């Protein structure tokens, strides 16, 4: 019962160890990376409390790698039910 923004980053697999550095430096409390195909790729899933924080990660990735590499990032509105790292020590 805590609003959140689901930021999804789909890029090439070579950026697995570089995008994760941007996510961690932005204060994101945990991400979720997984393999992805398509005509190989990876899919990130970052849950941010506020949109301004999700766009902060979005801007720092698109202006750094999207000019040379190929990818798409989008935001979906998701409601977090339970999570210890996300909903503080007592919440949600």
């Amino acid at each position: 019962a805590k609003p959140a923004n689901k930021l999804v980053i789909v890029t090439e697999k070579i950026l697995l160890k570089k995008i994760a550095k941007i996510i961690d430096e932005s204060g994101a409390k945990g991400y979720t990376v997984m393999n992805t195909g398509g005509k190989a790729n990876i899919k990130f899933e970052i849950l941010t409390e506020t949109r301004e924080m999700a766009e902060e990660i979005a801007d720092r990735v698109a202006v750094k790698y999207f000019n040379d590499y190929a990818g798409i990032i989008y935001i979906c509105s998701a409601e977090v039910l339970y999570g210890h790292t996300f909903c503080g020590p007592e919440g949600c």
């Binding site: 070579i14 393999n35 190989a40 040379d68 590499y69």
Partner: protein
């Protein structure tokens, strides 16, 4: 004088070897529209296992042999890898429609070394009963790393001028996959004694896993062809003639070491083939993370689709045939 009568028979023998037959066989099934796919998990572990053996066989050979006997051929491999990249900077980077960032990227792969082509040279040499130095397999890192690093350094310098640091370039390039595995194989070979695990698990099925990987490269090389026709017509002329030109410079340098030291005439074939080969396993991933602005179809498709078959079907019979008519063989 050199004769082509046995060259055609030797060319066919390369055309039938599993290293090239699977690569060609992968093209045929992919062209016919096969739905067969090799899972990416298997491809990842094949790349690690192929290069660990290359690193291992280059480690147990550098510690078992006299270093003073193998310093000039090694110094030539370092010189050759840097020289090939600069050749593409002054030859390939000046045609009408060719991006200089892409020319350096494909020059780096052609200056680097091909595990499959090098493994086919050792196999063909012993099948022709030509003796070669046991540490010839240790020349892989001394031409691969200097060629990749030179491509990244020169391209980045060119990019900066178009609006510098070498160690961050080296440490990021060298610590990636398919390059740290070879150093791991090198470090274990020089210091430890992996002979029990090398000759039982890494040596016997090295060429077996190679055949699967050439099928992967052959299947995807059909897609690169046609996609390589959308960039320029000078990446086909280069990839067809550069392996011949690079090998002939390597052969000339190999003779200098052949007379200065006791470098065998069958050992300059490895040095010639190791230079004609264009990297297709640890080259593309390194250049992709080192030169992001480079089109990863003009340097991957020009070194895997055309670069490797020429260096493995037209270069190996040519240089082995050249060694036979020039001396021992």
């Amino acid at each position: 004088m050199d004769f082509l009568s046995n060259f055609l028979t030797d060319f066919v023998g390369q055309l039938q070897s599993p290293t090239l037959a699977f690569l060609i066989g992968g093209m045929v099934i992919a062209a016919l529209g096969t739905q067969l796919v090799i899972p990416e998990a298997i491809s990842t572990i094949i790349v690690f296992m192929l290069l660990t053996k290359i690193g291992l066989t280059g480690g147990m050979a550098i510690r078992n042999s006299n270093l003073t006997e193998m310093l000039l051929p090694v110094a030539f491999s370092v010189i050759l890898g840097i020289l090939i990249v600069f050749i593409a900077r002054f030859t390939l980077a000046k045609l009408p429609n060719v991006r200089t960032v892409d020319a350096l990227a494909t020059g780096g792969l052609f200056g680097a070394v091909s595990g499959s082509t090098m493994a086919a040279a050792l196999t063909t040499l012993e099948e022709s009963k030509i003796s070669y130095e046991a540490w010839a397999g240790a020349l892989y890192p001394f031409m691969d790393i200097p060629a990749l690093v030179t491509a990244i350094v020169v391209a980045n310098i060119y990019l900066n001028k178009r609006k510098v640091k070498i160690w961050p370039i080296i440490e990021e390039s060298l610590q990636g996959p398919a390059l740290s595995a070879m150093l791991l194989g090198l470090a274990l070979g020089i210091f430890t004694k992996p002979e029990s695990v090398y000759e039982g698990f890494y040596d016997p099925l090295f060429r077996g896993l190679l055949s699967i990987l050439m099928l992967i490269m052959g299947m995807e090389a059909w897609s690169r062809i046609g996609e390589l026709r959308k960039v320029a017509q000078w990446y086909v002329v280069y990839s067809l003639i550069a392996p011949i030109v690079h090998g002939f410079i390597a052969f000339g340098l190999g003779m200098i070491a052949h007379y200065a030291t006791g470098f065998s005439l069958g050992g300059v074939v490895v040095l010639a083939v190791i230079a004609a080969s264009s990297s297709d396993i640890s080259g593309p991933p390194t250049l992709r993370a080192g030169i992001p602005s480079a089109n990863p179809s003009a340097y991957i498709g020009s070194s895997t689709a055309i670069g490797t078959p020429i260096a493995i079907g037209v270069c190996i019979p040519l240089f082995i045939g050249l060694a036979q008519t020039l001396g021992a063989g």
